[PDB]
RNA sequence: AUACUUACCUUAAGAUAUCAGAGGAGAUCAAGAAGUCCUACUGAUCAAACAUGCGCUUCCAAGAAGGACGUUAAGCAUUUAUCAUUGAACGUUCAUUGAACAUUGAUGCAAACUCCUUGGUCACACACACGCGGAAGGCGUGUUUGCUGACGUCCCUUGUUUCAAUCAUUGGUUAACUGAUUUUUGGGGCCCUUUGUUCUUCUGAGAAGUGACACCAAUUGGUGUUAGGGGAGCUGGGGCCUUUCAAAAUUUUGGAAGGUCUUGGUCGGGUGGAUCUUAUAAUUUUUGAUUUA
């Protein structure tokens, strides 16, 4: 997976931002959160072909300013579903989150 | 009585209008006198037939119910007919 | 067009909106309605009239459509040869701005009547 | 309600275009509040000519427009 | 005795409308006018199998991309040919016409 | 019934065609009419745009230039000069070809404004009713003015020049008159 | 402005919530109509405005949306640039006579550049998940009215923001300290397109004012502007908390009062207008001659 930054958080709420990022990057996972911490940050998750597309980058956003790519620190959930137990991992992560 | 649009057509007297007709003919010329029933009389009329030709009438009188629309000049955009709040100076007695 | 037209508004509430009124011919008029009447004679400010040609109509059949626009500006369309009207753009100035503008228009009108009463004296 | 303003055309040779291709030339003998039109010496012009009798009266529904062929 | 009053009992009801052109319209009535200028929010409108004038009148109304989905359509009365009511609605309730009742008591 | 005239701010007690025609041709109506239309245009030209001008957020700004304001009397004076000059530039047309073709055989059918046949019947019909108290036409031929330089015509007028740059002309023309 | 003269014209009708009772019009015939009509009467639904919410929903910065009635551009491909009569030569060509836009176009396919107008280029932050005030609509609650409106408060500032110093006042703790507010000085940033360097006038930020100003025509006539922000007083609404009273089985509901927060403001009429009925389903817009047979 790859996390992109500076991606113009005031574009949309949920799905129109997933359309505007997929349009300027004309993928199976484009996670974008409305929380204040993850604001101008998003995470797309296709892993080796996604690494090739991340190695292809120079990409600017439809609202304007250029987006910086980066590799994901852990994974997306779709990568963990591709590697598939996992439900117990989701339960443990939720139990750490509510803690 | 009239209502706003035919009052506007009563306003744009003697000024260069363009009429489409239902036939597709778009007469153009100075507007001699419109009536309330939208029968409009025109002068120095230049006409476009549906076939694509152009001719010049002097003095036409096109009936209202075959008008497709009429275009008045631009300035009547700013007209006192459109003023929503102009108060009436004590109607007659 | 995501314009989200007022779900309880008719013509008088639609004033100064940018319309897309459609006729019996299939011609479209686009512009600010500034007035209507009982017979649905509209005025249409800065109006542009678009047809499709007979040839482009073939492409319209079950896409990029070379609509032909002439510019009719301030026109005053008739209620006989129309079909239906919709709304295309919201007006320039918002509801607060329209509201304050109407307040100012009414204050100026009352003032002009005071001046008529003064000149009558 | 208002009777039309054909008073200037009262004796002058006018040319109706009737209906979309009918073109009739006469002299305006009369008009009513509906633009029913009494013409004298109607002479229908096809682009061939055909004369239309002494007097004629033409429905103000069918009449599209009329031109003054005579000078005013 | 006019039946437009019948339609005036039908605000916020979901009908279809077939026009004299051949346009078919689906979407709720917000109101109806005296001479049946019916205003309709949440339309999507369709043209059955074709009429070229109706093809133009369909495409040109925006949001065509042949179902055209439109937020708000006023429709003129002399364009409305026929209007299909919902079958859930009971006609025995609506045709009673309190004006016609009062006129029977006025006689 | 009542026909309110929005310009005159008067009424017509019962609308009919003849009082409408007689009112819309009336000189009082035309005067208040013309005042109003001029008035709307001079308002819209006077009215400043005052856009929002959404100011963006931004090293190389090292150069600084001096603005130039004026006095309030100087402001009002230069604005008055510009008003007069706009009013000139809109109104003025170019004569020349009238003064150029003065002697011509068919000047008096073509440029004498209602002998042209095309606009010709207008200016007779557009003539106002002349109820208050107090043309070179087609008759003119070649043999009216046989020899134009016998009876002295005035010369071709000297061309006009911006007074703002009137100081920068060629001093001392060749060939004195 | 006044007088005189002439010309033209003088009234479409009705209603303004709807339904059911209370009472009236206390119904002119031997106890009673039925109905219909009115109402500061009540109850129910509907409509409109205002206020408040909705942990409503959506949209808000080199690019995105829209447009070019611009070009590259004679870019490339295709098609078309009258009829009739007479004569001659082998349907065609030429000549004569009579009758009635434009090829650099038109149509199709795009593509690119340039240009134009709009927008929270907000506040916060630049980070490893799975914020307030804007704009548009929907829903809910409450008030008010059954159409609408016409006719018969004070003070400060208007380049803004932040930091330090000085002084005044007020509170707390033991003359010292801390916090708040106001004034002055200075510096930094942003901005001055405020394009006339700024609600109007004048002067080169200051001064005055809230009928005046600005301006076009010929003192008269016409149009526009008289603003924006902040605070206080007062008032309206919502939310929370406390007290009291009532009802139901410690809890719930309703009313009142106080405190705190947030948002907003500072009777009549032959009158007209708006909406809806009726003339009005017969040639002029709503009771069909625009699915081309
Ligand atoms: Zn007048």
From Swiss-Prot, chain A:
Q: Which family does it belong to?
A: Belongs to the RRM U1 A/B'' family.
Misc: Present with 2950 molecules/cell in log phase SD medium.
The protein in question is named U1 small nuclear ribonucleoprotein A
* Function of the molecule: Involved in nuclear mRNA splicing. The principal role of the U1A is to help fold or maintain U1 RNA in an active configuration. It is the first snRNP to interact with pre-mRNA. This interaction is required for the subsequent binding of U2 snRNP and the U4/U6/U5 tri-snRNP.
The outcome of changing residue 28 to I is: Sensitive in DMS protection of U1 snRNA
Describe the subunit structure.
Component of the spliceosome where it is associated with snRNP U1.
Q: Which residues form the RRM domain?
A: 1-74
Places the protein is found: Nucleus
Swiss-Prot record, chain C:
Which spans does this entry mark as compositional bias, Basic and acidic residues? 98-108
Q: What do the Gene Ontology cellular component annotations say?
A: catalytic step 2 spliceosome; commitment complex; cytoplasm; nucleus; Prp19 complex; spliceosomal complex; U1 snRNP; U2 snRNP
The domain of life for this entry's organism is: Eukaryota
Q: Where in the cell is it found?
A: Nucleus; Cytoplasm
Claim: Aminoacyl-tRNA synthetase is one of the keywords in the record: no
**Known role:** Plays a role in pre-mRNA splicing as a core component of the spliceosomal U1, U2, U4 and U5 small nuclear ribonucleoproteins (snRNPs), the building blocks of the spliceosome.
Q: Look up the further comments and give them.
A: Present with 861 molecules/cell in log phase SD medium.
Quaternary context:
Component of the Sm core complex, present in spliceosomal snRNP U1, U2, U4/U6 and U5. The core complex contains SMB1, SMD1, SMD2, SMD3, SME1, SMX3 and SMX2 (Sm proteins B, D1, D2, D3, E, F and G, respectively), and is probably a heptameric ring structure. SMB1 specifically interacts with SMD3.
Its protein name is Small nuclear ribonucleoprotein-associated protein B
Q: Which organism is it from?
A: Saccharomyces cerevisiae (strain ATCC 204508 / S288c) (Baker's yeast)
Curated annotation (Swiss-Prot), chain D:
PROSITE patterns, A to Z:
SM
Q: What is its main location?
A: nucleus
Q: What InterPro entries does the database record attribute to this sequence?
A: Lsm7/SmG-like, LSM_dom_sf, Sm, Sm_dom_euk/arc, Sm_G
Q: What are the annotated GO cellular component locations?
A: catalytic step 2 spliceosome; commitment complex; cytoplasm; nucleus; precatalytic spliceosome; SMN-Sm protein complex; spliceosomal complex; spliceosomal tri-snRNP complex
Any single GO BP term: mRNA splicing, via spliceosome
SMART domains in the record, alphabetically? Answer: Sm (SM00651)
- Cite the entry's keywords alphabetically: Cytoplasm, mRNA processing, mRNA splicing, Nucleus, Ribonucleoprotein, RNA-binding, Spliceosome
According to the UniProt entry, its GO molecular function terms are: RNA binding
Superkingdom of origin:
Eukaryota
SUPFAM superfamilies hit by this protein: Sm-like ribonucleoproteins (SSF50182)
Q: Does the keyword Cytoplasm apply?
A: yes
Domain Sm as annotated: residue spans: 1-72
Q: Which Pfam families match?
A: LSM
Q: Which Gene3D superfamilies match?
A: 2.30.30.100
Locations listed in the record = Nucleus; Cytoplasm
- Family recorded in the similarity comment: Belongs to the snRNP Sm proteins family.
- How does this chain assemble? Component of the Sm core complex, present in spliceosomal snRNP U1, U2, U4/U6 and U5. The core complex contains SMB1, SMD1, SMD2, SMD3, SME1, SMX3 and SMX2 (Sm proteins B, D1, D2, D3, E, F and G, respectively), and is probably a heptameric ring structure. SMX2 specifically interacts with SME1.
Please, what other remarks does the record include? Present with 1400 molecules/cell in log phase SD medium.
UniProt function note = Plays a role in pre-mRNA splicing as a core component of the spliceosomal U1, U2, U4 and U5 small nuclear ribonucleoproteins (snRNPs), the building blocks of the spliceosome.
Q: What is this protein called?
A: Small nuclear ribonucleoprotein G
The protein's gene is named SMX2
UniProtKB/Swiss-Prot annotation, chain F:
Q: Where are the zinc fingers (Matrin-type)?
A: 3-35
Single Gene Ontology MF annotation? U1 snRNA binding
Naming one, the record's GO cellular component terms include: U1 snRNP
Q: Does the keyword RNA-binding apply?
A: yes
Any keyword Ion transport? no
Q: What is its main location?
A: nucleus
Residues annotated as coiled-coil are: none
**Biological processes per GO annotation:** mRNA 5'-splice site recognition; mRNA splicing, via spliceosome; spliceosomal snRNP assembly
Q: How does it assemble?
A: U1 snRNP is composed of the 7 core Sm proteins SMB1, SMD1, SMD2, SMD3, SME1, SMX3 and SMX2 (Sm proteins B, D1, D2, D3, E, F and G, respectively) that assemble in a heptameric protein ring on the Sm site of the small nuclear RNA to form the core snRNP, and at least 10 U1 snRNP-specific proteins SNP1/U1-70K, MUD1/U1-A, YHC1/U1-C, LUC7, NAM8, PRP39, PRP40, PRP42, SNU56 and SNU71. YHC1/U1-C interacts with U1 snRNA and the 5' splice-site region of the pre-mRNA.
| Protein function | Component of the spliceosomal U1 snRNP, which is essential for recognition of the pre-mRNA 5' splice-site and the subsequent assembly of the spliceosome. YHC1/U1-C is directly involved in initial 5' splice-site recognition for both constitutive and regulated alternative splicing. The interaction with the 5' splice-site seems to precede base-pairing between the pre-mRNA and the U1 snRNA. Stimulates commitment or early (E) complex formation by stabilizing the base pairing of the 5' end of the U1 snRNA and the 5' splice-site region.
Q: Give any extra note attached to this record.
A: Present with 2140 molecules/cell in log phase SD medium.
Tell me what this protein is called.
Answer: U1 small nuclear ribonucleoprotein C
